[PDB]
Amino acid sequence: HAASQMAKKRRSYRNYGLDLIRGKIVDEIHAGVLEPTISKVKSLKSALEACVAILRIDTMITVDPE
Amino acid sequence: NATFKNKEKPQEVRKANIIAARSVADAIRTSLGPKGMDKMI
Numbered sequence: 001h002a003a004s005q006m007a008k009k010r011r012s013y014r015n016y017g018l019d020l021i022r023g024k025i026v027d028e029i030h031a032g033v034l035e036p037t038i039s040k041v042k043s044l045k046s047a048l049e050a051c052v053a054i055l056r057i058d059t060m061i062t063v064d065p066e
Numbered sequence: 067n068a069t070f071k072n073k074e075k076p077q078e079v080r081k082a083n084i085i086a087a088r089s090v091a092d093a094i095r096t097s098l099g100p101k102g103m104d105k106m107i
């Protein structure tokens with residue numbers, strides 16, 4: 001990818017994922033490794049929404065219960 | 067000189083209140099401004 005985004009021109013080829021079963025980099029679109037955009041788009045926007053609300057935490061007052 | 071003594075002294079109760087009270091506005095100080103941080107209770 002670091003390279004592909006050099007003319008991203010030649011024959012641009014991201015979509016290069018991991019093929020752990022064999023242990024090599026392959027084109028996942030070809031190989032058949034598909035995932036809906038809607039996931040990784042919410043999976044991301046969300047996970048940070050957490051990290052930030054926590055990044056702001058600097059004092060944790062824990063009241064005594066009953 | 068030699069005049070009025072004030073036998074009584076809960077002078078300390080005041081300074082005691084102030085200190086046990088100022089300690090409150092302490093825990094808060096950190097959350098003032100665009101650099102203020104939130105508390106988690």
Ligand SMILES: Nc1ncnc2c1ncn2[C@@H]1O[C@H](COP(=O)(O)OP(=O)(O)O)[C@@H](O)[C@H]1O
Nearest residue numbers: 093094095096097098099100101102103104105
């Ligand atoms: N742009 C800024 N630069 C410097 N001070 C600011 C800026 N914007 C608001 N502040 C300061 O943030 C201070 C504290 O705000 P906050 O921490 O929300 O407590 P409160 O607003 O309840 O006093 C405000 O008194 C204001 O002076």
